[PDB]
Amino acid sequence: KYQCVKLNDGHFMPVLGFGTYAPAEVPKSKALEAVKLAIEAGFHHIDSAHVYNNEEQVGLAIRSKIADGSVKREDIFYTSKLWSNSHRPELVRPALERSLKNLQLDYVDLYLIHFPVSVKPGEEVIPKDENGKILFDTVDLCATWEAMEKCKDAGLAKSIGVSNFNHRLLEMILNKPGLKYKPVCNQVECHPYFNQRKLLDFCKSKDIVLVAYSALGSHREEPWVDPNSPVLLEDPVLCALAKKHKRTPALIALRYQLQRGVVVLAKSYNEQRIRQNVQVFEFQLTSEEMKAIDGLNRNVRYLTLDIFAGPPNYPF
Numbered sequence: 668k669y670q671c672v673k674l675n676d677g678h679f680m681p682v683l684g685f686g687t688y689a690p691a692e693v694p695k696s697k698a699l700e701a702v703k704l705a706i707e708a709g710f711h712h713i714d715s716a717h718v719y720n721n722e723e724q725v726g727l728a729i730r731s732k733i734a735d736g737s738v739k740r741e742d743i744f745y746t747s748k749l750w751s752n753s754h755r756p757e758l759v760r761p762a763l764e765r766s767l768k769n770l771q772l773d774y775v776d777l778y779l780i781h782f783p784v785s786v787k788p789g790e791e792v793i794p795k796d797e798n799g800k801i802l803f804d805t806v807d808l809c810a811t812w813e814a815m816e817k818c819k820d821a822g823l824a825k826s827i828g829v830s831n832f833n834h835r836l837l838e839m840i841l842n843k844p845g846l847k848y849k850p851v852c853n854q855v856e857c858h859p860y861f862n863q864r865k866l867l868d869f870c871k872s873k874d875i876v877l878v879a880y881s882a883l884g885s886h887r888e889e890p891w892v893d894p895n896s897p898v899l900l901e902d903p904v905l906c907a908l909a910k911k912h913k914r915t916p917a918l919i920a921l922r923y924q925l926q927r928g929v930v931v932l933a934k935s936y937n938e939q940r941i942r943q944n945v946q947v948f949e950f951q952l953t954s955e956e957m958k959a960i961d962g963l964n965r966n967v968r969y970l971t972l973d974i975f976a977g978p979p980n981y982p983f
């Protein structure tokens with residue numbers, strides 16, 4: 668048994684997920700080990716993506732832990748994400764099948780539209796012209812979404828959702844004529860310096876689950892993230908609270924999300940921090956602590972993905 672939330676399609680999502688992205692210079696071997704450790708520690712939800720270039724390793728971890736008798740497939744919730752070179756509707760299922768082939772899994776539990784800006788089809792995930800300009804594409808995300816819904820009907824994705832959508836883009840999908848399956852979730856950046864209250868309430872109102880990424884203040888990797896931005900975990904109130912509960916600032920940040928009805932991801936490739944993070948289910952925060960964490964909010968977005976700024980669908 669483990670804590671899950673009922674999704675709007677009737678499937679269940681474990682409320683703590685294991686983030687698997689690491690910078691290109693971390694060897695891929697470390698993903699294999701880290702995901703095995705995550706499963707051993709009690710993570711039942713694993714979050715990856717095509718663009719993380721780790722699905723071979725992440726899939727091997729999962730296969731290994733099923734084959735070794737540690738876990739059944741039905742007690743792993745695995746998420747992949749459709750990258751923006753395959754937004755064209757005819758390209759959606761091939762991209763999902765490619766991920767499945769890399770993973771050697773029969774299905775993903777969740778398939779997400781990773782980012783709403785589309786780029787040119789082909790093998791390169793960030794296609795550039797000869798002068799280094801990103802090659803943007805124009806695609807109707809409503810047609811992308813229909814192709815996702817067919818992947819669900821094919822059984823290849825148990826559930827489908829989105830990521831890095833704003834209000835407008837979610838409404839675009841929700842208000843789509845002939846809409847068959849709402850998104851189960853919107854995975855977006857969320858932490859005490861960017862608590863997303865507005866978008867969170869919107870999602871709740873539509874029974875869409877908000878899935879928090881960079882819940883611990885992000886990988887802080889250059890050039891994805893500005894090195895001058897404030898370190899979330901160094902925050903005095905979070906450290907005060909941690910010290911008080913004999914926990915860690917990370918644990919306080921993750922607990923904050925769980926109590927406000929957000930599903931929270933946490934990446935770590937460190938054995939001790941992997942085990943530490945599952946301790947989020949061992950303590951609880953009072954209303955006064957929760958309000959204190961709310962007051963940290965300061966509109967700090969770590970992940971702008973601004974190399975994809977310009978086209979209309981850029982979400983921030």
Ligand SMILES: NC(=O)c1ccc[n+]([C@@H]2O[C@H](COP(=O)([O-])OP(=O)(O)OC[C@H]3O[C@@H](n4cnc5c(N)ncnc54)[C@H](OP(=O)(O)O)[C@@H]3O)[C@@H](O)[C@H]2O)c1
Binds near residue numbers: 687886917933940
């Ligand atoms: N949909 C998207 O666009 C999108 C965007 C960003 C992230 N994501 C997903 O969300 C996941 C997590 O977000 P993220 O990678 O930015 O990092 P995140 O979880 O905020 O955490 C970042 C850093 O926290 C450290 N950490 C973990 N546990 C800790 C602890 N208990 N105490 C102190 N430090 C701790 C990790 O380092 P160690 O590894 O050394 O422990 C990691 O570098 C990603 O891996 C990915 O699956 C999705």
Ligand SMILES: COc1ccc2cc([C@H](C)C(=O)O)ccc2c1
Binds near residue numbers: 688970
């Ligand atoms: C190699 O090319 C990429 C492209 C897009 C990426 C998006 C992301 C986001 C930050 C994410 O979902 O973590 C990560 C890595 C990426 C690598």
